[PDB]
From Swiss-Prot:
Keywords: Acetylation, Cell membrane, Cytoplasm, Disease variant, Lyase, Membrane, Metal-binding, Osteopetrosis, Phosphoprotein, Zinc. Changing E103D: Normal CO(2) hydrase activity. The record marks Q89 as: Involved in the binding of some activators, including histamine and L-histidine. The lineage of its organism: Eukaryota, Metazoa, Chordata, Craniata, Vertebrata. One of its GO terms (biological process) is positive regulation of synaptic transmission, GABAergic. GO terms for cellular component: apical part of cell; cytoplasm; cytosol; extracellular exosome; myelin sheath; plasma membrane. Changing K15E: In Jogjakarta. It comes from Homo sapiens (Human). This is Carbonic anhydrase 2.
Length: 257
């Protein structure tokens, strides 16, 4: 019954998931002046042209768009990664106000939201097995700021009324996640974890330097979603972000100077 409230939020999670206080937890603050440029980092390879979106779902802690990951259709490769990572789903974290909502921060700056494109390493065969491995997942993180609208996001926001409450899902085919990407693929990378329970330490994080801009109307539609199931007291789905965790014995690497 974990969540993001006063009595079940991130400060409580360690009781059910003691790895919450582990050695490679996420998110973290990205100190841009301390991140080390690593000229050996290869360019990110994002191959999304054959992506097959399936469903969109309110899972009670966010909403997610799920993809067919039974074939190499939408994959992430290169960068700090060895091998091929299949896109399983994407989801967002966002705030009650534009000055908060992101999980990662940049020089302590919070963005209005953060997009996570979740991929798993095909050498482990399925995502359940991948989450048990130190290099099982690669999550591509993209910051959202409020300004101009993001046209590629609009098809997502327009269906959110149909999945307002926990458990609701809808058909969401032929969605192209390339429409969510910024111009630059410049990134920071570090070894980390899931940012929701079970907080497994299985993620190579790849966080893009360039945020995308979304409109105030687009983020307002995020904030109209509900944590609760239908018929329960309405609690707006906002501030579903875990705060920055201690960096401990890790170095964030940058793909750029
Ligand atoms: C669907 C979902 O919300 O997460 C589940 C689950 O919590 C986790 O134990 C594992 C089991 O299937 O992974 C999936 S997930 O792959 O789709 N999932 C989504 C949210 C988590 O993303 S996060 N915020 O680290 O980036 C990563 C794992
Ligand atoms: Zn996430």
């Amino acid at each position: 019954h974990w969540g993001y409230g006063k009595h079940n939020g991130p400060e409580h999670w360690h009781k059910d998931f003691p790895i919450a206080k582990g050695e490679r937890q996420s998110p973290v603050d990205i100190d841009t002046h301390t991140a080390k440029y690593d000229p050996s980092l290869k360019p990110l390879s994002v191959s999304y042209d054959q992506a097959t979106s399936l469903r969109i779902l309110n899972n009670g802690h966010s909403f997610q768009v799920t993809f067919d990951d039974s074939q190499d259709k939408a994959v992430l490769k290169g960068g700090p990664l060895d091998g091929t990572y299949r896109l399983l789903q994407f989801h967002f974290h966002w705030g009650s106000l534009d000055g908060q909502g992101s999980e990662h921060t940049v020089d302590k700056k919070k963005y209005a939201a953060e997009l996570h494109l979740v991929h798993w390493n095909t050498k482990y065969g399925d995502v359940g097995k991948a989450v048990q491995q130190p290099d099982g997942l690669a999550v591509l993180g993209i910051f959202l700021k409020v300004g101009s609208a993001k046209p590629g996001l609009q098809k997502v926001v327009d269906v959110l009324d149909s999945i307002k409450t926990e458990g609701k899902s809808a058909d969401f085919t032929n969605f192209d996640p390339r429409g969510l990407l910024p111009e630059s693929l410049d990134y920071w990378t570090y070894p980390g974890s899931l940012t929701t329970p079970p907080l497994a330490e299985c993620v190579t994080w790849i966080v893009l330097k360039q945020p995308i801009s979304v409109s105030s109307e687009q983020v307002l539609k995020f904030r109209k979603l509900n944590f609760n199931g239908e018929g329960e007291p309405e609690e707006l789905m906002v501030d579903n972000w875990r705060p920055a965790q201690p960096l401990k014995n890790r170095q964030i690497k940058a793909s750029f100077k």
